[PDB]
Amino acid sequence: QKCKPTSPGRRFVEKVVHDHLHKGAPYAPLVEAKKRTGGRNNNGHITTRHVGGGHKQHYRIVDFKRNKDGVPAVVERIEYDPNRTAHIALLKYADGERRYIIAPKGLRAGDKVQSGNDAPIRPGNCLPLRNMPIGSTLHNVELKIGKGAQLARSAGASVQLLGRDGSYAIIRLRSGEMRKVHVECRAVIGEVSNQENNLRSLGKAGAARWRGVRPTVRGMAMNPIDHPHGGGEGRNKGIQPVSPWGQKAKGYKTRTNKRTTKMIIRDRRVK
RNA sequence: AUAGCACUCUGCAAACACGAAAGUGGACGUAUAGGGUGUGAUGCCUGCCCGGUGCUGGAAGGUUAAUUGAUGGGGUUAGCG
């Protein structure tokens, strides 16, 4: 869906339209306040540039652990979440408890989900990797027993279960990495919803300002005191590209962790 | 500056930033995400060069630090003259 060019700022706007989303307010008992930061830490200094402004948002409490084992639940509705790119699903359990989960692709109001060792193989069901079938497509992959889902949670994301060896399952991630995960950790059947999210076109600078991104100033445009790229009469680069703090930006690798190297079977390649 | 484009880094106790540390931002986010760099709607497009500098990946040959202390050369004196 592309907007008509009735004004110059509308010529290149492309939105994604899902008519099945809930139109009303979110579920109040599962919503809490959240303040803006401006990219500043407790010293008051800017630690992440280009952050500030944007629309006011509430936080939605999403159940990532899925520890309500054995109790079936029905989907009430699919909701828009301002905190993430994925849609969320409101669940009503057989005992009347309500929770939010990351909505898998295809899930609608009326579908049935559950979690545990003996949960049936359906999208949105949460099971241990030791019980997942080989070759299946999963999302919301847990890394520490009991911590909850951490991997493959963004819109349209999924991982592939390749095999099980010892106490570890082998998974392929969207980045191309092949990784080991302890078989006691849980995952969710299916892929994340809103997979058309990357087809949107903002169309104007105000659309990014609404999302809270402040403008980026190139190092080429500064003075020598501000940036290694600054200075010169006219336009000239004359230097291998670096960050404002002097770290090379073209191909130089920055990973330093040595504690978790054993879990990486095969790197995505040019890391 | 900008929407759009591209390269590259980052598997989460993420990279990156602040700080002496504790800790904090990134983010109560998880590669359709986050940082850095360049270009600047859109249309048609974007040729040749890896010798130099850099980056990435190999090789185990040559060179090299602390550490180690085999040998050789002196000082001194019991004794012998």
Swiss-Prot record:
The keyword Electron transport does not apply. GO terms for cellular component: large ribosomal subunit. GO terms for biological process: cytoplasmic translation. Pfam families: Ribosomal_L2, Ribosomal_L2_C. Residues 226-236 have a biased composition (Basic and acidic residues). Residues 35-54, 221-253 are annotated as: Disordered. Keywords: Ribonucleoprotein, Ribosomal protein, RNA-binding, rRNA-binding. Belongs to the universal ribosomal protein uL2 family. HAMAP family: Ribosomal_uL2_B (MF_01320_B). Part of the 50S ribosomal subunit. Forms a bridge to the 30S subunit in the 70S ribosome. This is Large ribosomal subunit protein uL2.
